[PDB]
């Protein structure tokens, strides 16, 4: 008539040790079984917690936070025992988080993380414990026959968890289970403690048993059919129904009812979707006021540059002060001033120190304030970039500038970010490894007892394409179905690989970024650590950490901004000779004829994004003369636009062929003037699809961002309301309707796939600098690009060819001139970077330089080796150096020196 049983012990694959099903499928299973509630109690972690809350909301199930543990106490010796801890409330959730972090921080061995039982004295309130059945403190001791020991245990829970500790009973046809229960029942009865049924769940369906066994062998490193393989699981450990459970425990309805009682007792709030900002350093002045002070000051720099130093300014300056007012009042009203301040500061620090930040910027850049703060470097009014596409007062959201830097610099930024906000408020972020296509076949093959060669035959048939799946591999490679039909072993293989594909095997590897908290990180996420209790990371990954409301900064391997950096040093050092102030890649005008000519010719080698094949043949196929269609580029180079035949209409519509209309040949208006000029008529962007709601029908833009999302969330009722609000507002703004109910019909299909222009222009700018640099500073730019590609000998040779094809001097290796990096001669000739000689490397190079900077230096081969410290200049390095042509201006050719090297190396050691 209502709930009889909810599951209080369940692993998903985040347990890693075991488990099969992910977090959302368990939640649906529980929902389909008609349960109101569901604990996922993964093994010493809460990795899936944020995903659990999201999925529960969506399905009408209440999440019960908890975790399983190996537990250790003096009473049982070195024998580890099982406990389940549930969080009944938010005090409990915190203690549970503190536990898990304590297990990990302590370090651990082959046995895995463990907690000491005595930790459960301080870390207590708000937790409910389940005994662990036959493998718990109390269960093992009942099994013994040691009445006393049972008592010294039972006393501990009586002292510390008075009505908060349950004798767990489990019927999964495992050994000692039915003896334990029978004793535990007698214990509860006698000592007056409560019992609870659990099914110790590991997989959704009984038939998944074999898949889970395999999953475990892969973790444990055993072959399926090894007699020594630990077999700790039963086919019974599946997501059993309410009916199935009441039948299993019919003799003890209290064990079931206590399920339901515990579930009602557990209510943990996990707020999602909203920041907990940390506090910015502000001294006096409210956070709200400091933002306006520095946003206004910022705008003072931007206004003097843009509309330059002559006092016209005021001619369209009001529009600027105007828009900043609007944003400042929204940011402040929504609680975000600190978010801008802390990105603001960070971005400045990285410009100041030696850290390039990726383009990214999110949908920011539509924010005048960001530009004022120099978080972004485009003028949003110039390119009709919208603030409301980034922060909309009409909607609950988290503004994200999607800022990222390269992982290698992690140590530096954590350092600084910990100056700002405090050591333990700062932390790295976990990443998980899953078993993709190739790996899962490799591993299931191993487990099923095949030799490498057998299994590898199937693996080679899996394409290497990123994000490849088995289903797709079966689509693209006709040999896969073929052999799957022919070979039972091969089909057994793949059948199981298919159940294991995508399961979580472990943590990185490496972190995914850094997170910043308002206080201690453990007030927000638990910690995971390695065997040594080191490399602490939050147990919630990137996305999860986000949605829990921490400010985060991702890692990215993005050599593009590092190149721009290097070339920029190279340009700015040529200033010391010239002078001529230093360059600000930001003071670049975005209307440079010589750069646009360069683009129009389509020599876009080494220029961000558009260096592909098809791109060079669309640059040419339309010839962009301004910055505004640089933005357009990446929106056009897409499968969808050309599938319909939209790009075609664009390239003609410029010059071109045909004729300007706002938008369609018939269906057009004049007030759509400024909104479509930059894009030659066509609605190219989402920004513009809001803007035509705004000036035709008159939406507040905030309102217009909503219409757009509705056209995204196509459902009749939301759209029918808006279908008339547009149609009524067309008369309100005046005049001609009827036309409206047709331009609206098709603006709803120019925005079905329109680009995020603010996103587009973030990247376009970085491309434009890259273009500029090449046009204006070829020697330095190409130098820098060559420095980034130094690992790959083949790409370097491709680049020198490019250098010579664009007509630049490129000098092969020389020991007297060359450096590590690749640079520019006093004569503007690229000097080869010795790093580019595979095999040498930074140490030996470094050494050579320091020796050259000591006595000019380097008559012949002998002169070097004699000075150079031997074994820091390994003979291995001297052959490599010889054989590149480093000494070819200064005496004998390669061969003759390879027969002189031996002797050269004896005259040194003196």
Swiss-Prot record:
Subunit annotation: The DNA polymerase III holoenzyme complex contains at least 10 different subunits organized into 3 functionally essential subassemblies: the Pol III core, the beta sliding clamp processivity factor and the clamp-loading complex. The Pol III core (subunits alpha, epsilon and theta) contains the polymerase and the 3'-5' exonuclease proofreading activities. The polymerase is tethered to the template via the dimeric beta sliding clamp processivity factor.
Protein name: DNA polymerase III subunit alpha
Gene Ontology annotations of biological process type: DNA-templated DNA replication; lagging strand elongation; leading strand elongation
Catalyzed chemical reaction(s): DNA(n) + a 2'-deoxyribonucleoside 5'-triphosphate = DNA(n+1) + diphosphate
Compartmental location: Cytoplasm
GO CC term, one of those recorded: DNA polymerase III, core complex
Keyword vocabulary terms for this entry: Cytoplasm, DNA replication, DNA-binding, DNA-directed DNA polymerase, Nucleotidyltransferase, Transferase
Source taxonomy: Bacteria, Pseudomonadati, Pseudomonadota, Gammaproteobacteria, Enterobacterales
Keyword Plastid: no
